[PDB]
């Protein structure tokens, strides 16, 4: 593998987590903890003073992050600011997994020029992760402009007909551009996990 | 009013529509018949000798199409070639309601360069009808690029979780703050009926 | 355009907003801020003493509103009192955009006479915005009685089978009257944005 | 009891229904057969020589229709011409259950003046069956204007997000505080079966 | 009519309500207020000392209730205790409307004998209102055993696949017994309104 | 194991199933083929001369049906006559898996007296399969009256918001605390496969 | 029967429950109370000092549990830790009903080896209850490896496309392995009730 | 780019596709036509004499299939025999896009021993396409056992609450943290188009 150790922090207590983390005391490899509330990192910090917490991403990393495993980069593209929390979970997961990451945020198609202003960056990625909720159409527009794997992530932030990400999920599954592959809602971690594999062939 | 008479032919038979058309033929000039299957017209055709069937729109008109009443036009914009049937329903009722139509077909977002190629023609419309299935992304992109009212039609073409146009409809509905407004799945007639009202919002009395 | 500047206040902090508003210090044009909680206008008011807050609408306007751009008016029609908050977001958005607005409230069809009591007002509008949740049927009844563009807005206020506006959305999409066009749920802003364009041809 | 015998013919064959009808023909006077396709009756028809097929209702009766048992009537009110098949199912079972029916067809809300034209006849019913598809607005409007019990039937006619009558059903269900009550999609028989109970809630013994 | 005056208390304030109630100071007829929280009747009571509040039903009645308008009775049938609040809204609405009411509670089919133990009461009603959520099947069982109008009311009290009354709604719409008519979820008022009309032919 | 071999014939052709049956005919005694349309068997029939088609169950067996392995029986209980096809699928696979079956058809709840008439036979089963569409009330009623395991099958027969068995399925699922357990819509085979395991939970070695 | 007395504690007050429990003062048989909050057992304990409360299961048992009625055992299989509360309701219900129970937890297929590490235990049960939410696929995998009745229980613990157990319900109904039978969501009690009957033939 | 040209033939006629193919035949080497019904090819076939129809994939190629561009392979893994049509769509477009494919059909989880039998071949792929209907459990099991990217395709084969692939799709989507990624129902072409990009991430210039 070489895959860092991943702790799903949703169902675990701060004590239970320190118990898993320090039980991995023998690893030169980093440890990622995803879906970790700020109130729970508050609890953890005295036990793990060498840990790093990423507010938006709700991710914690313990350990020395070594250099990127590979030169190419993953691009993480978002439609709007409401998408930032789950995009950040994809960026931190990908970086902890050893990938260089280029963050291309707020390029939703209501101001499509912003998407073109940053298009050379998207086109130079080995993998593109597209993240959207309201403007789920962005996956299809990105997918029509790039010749690399695109992994779409629907998010649950939206209004009434967003159906808490469900519309966004169906929109990405139904993209008229080919080459788009989809993960379940809010699952930025899952997208980065796959993108990391694809990137490090 | 000034509107043509409209017959919804999906539920009705050939015999039944000949009745309506011959009862309305007393006046009113143009008569628009929507959702008329190729087979129903074939059975109509000898009874109504002046009717024109617009095959791919699945529409039938009797009476001659008017000269455009306003100087603008309506842009009918299309994502793919399979959006053409409800696009032609929209464009044929728009023309029958007295509007000039400009067709911008097959500029979906898998080759968005094609949409920029025609963006001069779209911005120059008074109203824009955008027709798309699958993701329905085309409406969002158009809505953000033009400052004219846009009316989005989701089509039922697709596969799998296409859910017969639902994905398209819901996606277009989530772009309304861009100046977009939406009708029901495959409802090209409805779209054109509204665009026509918008597009139509005189002739000098003393000539030689 | 001539369109006033619009700030979506849902995802932004009171400080972030003052930052956008005062960064538009060079505009003779008004600035509309939609979806702004009363607790957030509480925060804003010392910074923007010249601002106006509309309670029902959750809209804030900074700037000198100049005269209507055009003589005709938009009619905003509602089924019941539960519809007032999102109807008010349509009325304030339309007025800030430069349209004269005639408010025709509480004319749901359980007392259809109220709808006829105010029918000359609806018929004289250039555009009609119809707003309903329970009595979503009102869009179709209005659409059958007027010869102008009607933009229907479903709202999320209702009981069990209202499906939080979803029934109302399907009802308006399926109107048997022609000439009705629909926006997503609760999106009074969007309706006024379009109605404003239509009005000012 | 006093009710006619009822055969639901949708799932059954021609051969199978001849069996039931000849087994029930021993007594019971009128026999109502619902959802009988035009083709099934054509195959029935020679075996049951007294059966009458009501084509557009897709119903079959054997035995003569009774004289109305109560003096009121049931109003069957319809939004559009394509609501006529489940309207005729409602009206033919109502008449077969011994009720006088008054048909008020094609008064949907796109021309609501037509509904006011007949409002005298609707208020004068004892029960009102309202039949509509698409929005189903007609039931709300009727429910608010009459103070008799109303039973609303959603029909499955429509297009797109019509969802085969769901939009109609849900819309009618959201008007029940107006004195409206609802049955399943296309269930004209169910509606008339209840209206008939409501409408039927004597003959002097000493005559010359 | 003779129908008492009905106030939907959901969207109105305690002050707004006293304003409607006392504006009906000239009526020998009662006034029903439905969907009224106990905290809101707490507010009302000093203004309306002659009012009556029904806890389960969330209904308030002001006025002298005169004798039943008619001899026959409405039967209100429930599947279980979770149905009691909305059944009580049907019973109080029917009684205020002038109907005698016979309450037949907790006869769900998991103990069908209870339903037979009270069957003569159900069979003697002019109208039966059936109320269920989990055991929505009860409408069909009752409808198969009685020869009078049955109005079914689905309720939102249930577990995961109850879909907050939606299953119960579809179950009653699809009863294999004929003669069942359905109202929207939780709408005990609506059922009694119709049942009252049917009862008083 | 001791189970017969099972071929799901819905997706497969006639040619394809002859292949499977002749490849499995080497041993295994009885072969159960489910969802075999009347037309597919007609095309099979000359190639497999010992196969018996159970028309209304839409099942095909080759090999002779065993003598019941356990002394109890399985009760297959049915709400209406149109539940008979998935009832016969359940009853024919149960009998092919070596169980005695007792059929209690057409005791739905619109005439619940019929269910009490046969309640002696239902209580006396070891397992009970209950098959119903529409409301699916029958499963609840049965679940509350018997203290044997009950397996409920929703059927897809119905109209309107029947939603092709969903209403039935959801209704049965909301009665599980009564000792009821549920399978997928129309899945009579699945039900009987489980009932058979439950029903089958020896022969003296020294006879004359 | 011999079935212990079961109290559904969801809709009942702590006082109402003591009222039912002590009204069963004449029983050599145990009494199970399911769906009982810890705050409600807090209330009960002074009245019923001989009661036992199971935290995860939210079950209370009063009475002397006698020996298992039968030698074979029910196996209770879970996909992950989020499934433990409703699996525990199945285990406690089955044990109170007189069945021996073998708890096989955390064997979801993302680490399928754990499922094989405990496969002899699953194969030796007379009945298997499978409990899953996210990894609802586990029912089908278990059902393909065992020759005994399998009763699947979907749970509501999950992420966006879990639809609060609904996906898990459809997944179990649609298992490609035969011999799987399904209960409604979260209904661990119901599964054990049936499993108990099947076990004690 | 280097990709073959792709024609989506579901919505198009025979006449219409001959047009596209003869207009694209000027260059581009291989032309992949998806969702081409057996009847449409029969009508195409005389006009395009070099076209090969892959019946069970419902695909048509013109031009010869390339030699694999990369040395790895793509594993196409299948739960059941009825997953074979969208598996063959995936495998035929993968091979047409220049990839070596290894087919691991009919290893669904009702006999999971079959999947372990071939696990050597699956781990040895560079990408894995997993195709399943009904529960769709196969994708989860595969996702947890391999450390290569997996692309899961839900198929619409099933019965009842299969909901035409929804159960499969939703189940696969709930296993993405295992390194799984998903496409739309029956979208074998989409899956192979992505797998092909992943699998394809030189030839020495100086030979004798
Ligand atoms: Mg715009
Ligand atoms: Mg009324
Ligand atoms: Mg039982
Ligand atoms: Mg993996
Ligand atoms: Zn598109
Ligand atoms: Zn209508
Ligand atoms: Zn039934
Ligand atoms: Zn499978």
UniProtKB/Swiss-Prot annotation, chains B, D, F, H:
Enzyme Commission number(s) from the entry: 2.5.1.143
GO cellular component terms, A-Z: plasma membrane
Biological process, per Gene Ontology: 'de novo' IMP biosynthetic process
Chief place where the protein resides: membrane
Subcellular location: Cell membrane
Any one GO MF annotation of this record: transferase activity
Cofactor requirements of the protein: Mg(2+)
Membrane topology: Multi-pass membrane protein
Thylakoid as UniProt keyword: no
Function description: Involved in the biosynthesis of a nickel-pincer cofactor ((SCS)Ni(II) pincer complex). Carboxylates the pyridinium ring of nicotinic acid adenine dinucleotide (NaAD) and cleaves the phosphoanhydride bond to release AMP and generate pyridinium-3,5-biscarboxylic acid mononucleotide (P2CMN). LarB can hydrolyze NaAD directly or it first forms an adduct with NaAD that releases AMP and reacts with bicarbonate/CO2 to generate P2CMN. Is required for the activation of the lactate racemase LarA. May also be involved in the activation of other nickel-pincer cofactor-dependent enzymes.
Protein's name according to its UniProt entry: Pyridinium-3,5-biscarboxylic acid mononucleotide synthase
Native source organism of the sequence: Lactiplantibacillus plantarum (strain ATCC BAA-793 / NCIMB 8826 / WCFS1) (Lactobacillus plantarum)
Covered residues, full protein: 46 to 246 of 246
């Amino acid at each position: 593998n070489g895959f860092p150790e991943v702790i799903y922090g949703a169902g675990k207590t701060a004590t239970q987590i320190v118990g898993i983390v320090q039980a991995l005391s023998q690893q030169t490899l980093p440890i990622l903890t995803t879906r970790l509330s700020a109130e729970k990192f508050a609890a953890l910090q005295p036990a793990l003073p060498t840990a790093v917490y990423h507010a938006t991403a709700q991710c914690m990393t313990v350990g020395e992050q070594p250099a990127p495993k590979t030169p190419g980069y993953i691009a993480v593209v978002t439609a709007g600011t409401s998408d930032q929390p789950v995009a950040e979970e994809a960026a931190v997961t990908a970086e902890t997994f050893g990938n260089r990451v280029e963050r291309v945020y707020d390029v939703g198609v209501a101001g499509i020029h912003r998407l073109f202003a940053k298009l050379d960056v998207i086109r130079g990625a080995r993998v593109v992760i597209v993240i959207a909720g309201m403007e789920g159409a962005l996956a299809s527009v990105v997918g029509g402009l790039v010749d690399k794997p695109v992994i779409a992530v629907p998010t649950s932030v939206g209004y009434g007909t967003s159906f808490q990400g469900m519309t966004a999920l169906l929109t990405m599954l139904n993209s008229c551009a080919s080459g788009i592959t989809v993960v379940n809602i809010d699952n930025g971690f899952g997208a980065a996990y796959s993108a990391s594999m694809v990137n490090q062939m």
